Structures are given as C-alpha cells and as structure tokens.
From a paper:
One specific mechanism used by nairoviruses is the production of a deubiquitinating enzyme, termed the vOTU, that disrupts the innate immune response. Interestingly, the nairoviral L segment also encodes a viral homologue of the ovarian tumor protease (OTU) at the N-terminus. Instead, the vOTU’s primary function appears to be the reversal of post-translational modifications by ubiquitin (Ub) and the Ub-like protein interferon stimulated gene product 15 (ISG15). Each vOTU possesses a seven-stranded beta sheet as the core feature, with five major alpha helices framing the rest of the structure.
Numbering used by the authors: 3 to 158
C-alpha cells in the first residue's frame, strides 16, 4: 500500500492474520543478510531483537520454555508433534529450520508481533502472515525467500 501500518490484515479465529496485499518488499524494507544455514530463522530474530546474531540459541530456549508451560497455545506445533517434549527435543537441535510454528510461539512468548513475508525470487510478496496483534512497524518482519529467512527493517 502506501504505509505498511495501514495494511488490511484478516484474522482467523486462531489469532493468525493473513494479508493478500502484493507489493515489492524492497520498496518499504531494507533487507539484512544473515548466514544461510538452518539456524537462519533464529539468526534473523536475534538480529532484529539485539542487532547481533549471538542470542539465537537463547531465543530457542525462550521458545522451549513457552512450549513446556503453554503447549495448548502452540497450535501449529501440535499439528506436527505429539507432545511438547518431542517438539522441544527437535527444535533445540542445530539446523532445525524455523518457520510459522516458531513464529507463532515466539510472538506469544515475547509479546511481540512477527510477520512472515513469503516472497518470490524478485522479492514480491506472495503471502503475508502475521502472528500477534501489533503493527508492521513494531513487528519482527521476516523475509522468506527461496528457502532462506532474512530479517527486514523499515526503510529510512
């Protein structure tokens, strides 16, 4: 649109919002490069919270604590795993690929909003999914492109 914070988000009853808006990410966001291994979701979240990659494992620990105490709120994780114990053992391993399951949990665990912007190779939004009630400008904006996750920041 004209302002990212004026996008129209459509919630489902699970509290996940979707947006059909289609624009080019790089007209509104600066991208940042993180190393392209299987930890990139966690590198990206760490970059946006701390301006450093070094906190990526502790973000996993925060997710794990939420999954242990609040498994019934881990809606997407419950589709993929029989119990919180199985989930935590898998997610905590190196090169576990983060995605919507972790975005949903982290948004609740840290009281932040996380947006997964699925992009094609030319950086056009294909799907946008927002976890949490907040606005684009306050969210952790993640670009999902060609199997890798990179942090985005609002331009200027």
């Amino acid at each position: 649109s004209f302002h990212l914070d004026d996008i129209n988000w459509q919630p489902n009853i699970e509290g996940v919002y979707n947006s059909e808006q289609r624009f080019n990410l790089n007209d509104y966001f600066t991208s940042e490069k993180v190393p392209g291994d299987g930890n990139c979701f966690f590198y990206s979240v760490s970059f946006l919270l701390f301006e450093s990659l070094s906190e990526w494992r502790s973000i996993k620990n925060t997710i794990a604590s939420f999954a242990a105490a609040n498994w019934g709120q881990c809606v997407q994780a419950k589709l993929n795993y029989a119990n919180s114990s199985d989930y935590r053992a898998d997610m905590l391993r190196n090169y576990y690929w983060g995605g919507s399951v972790e975005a949903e949990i982290l948004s609740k665990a840290l009281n932040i909003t996380i947006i997964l912007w699925e992009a094609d190779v030319s950086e056009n939004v294909v799907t946008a999914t927002k976890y949490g009630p907040g606005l684009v400008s306050t969210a952790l904006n993640l670009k999902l492109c060609q199997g890798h996750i990179e942090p985005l920041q609002l331009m200027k």
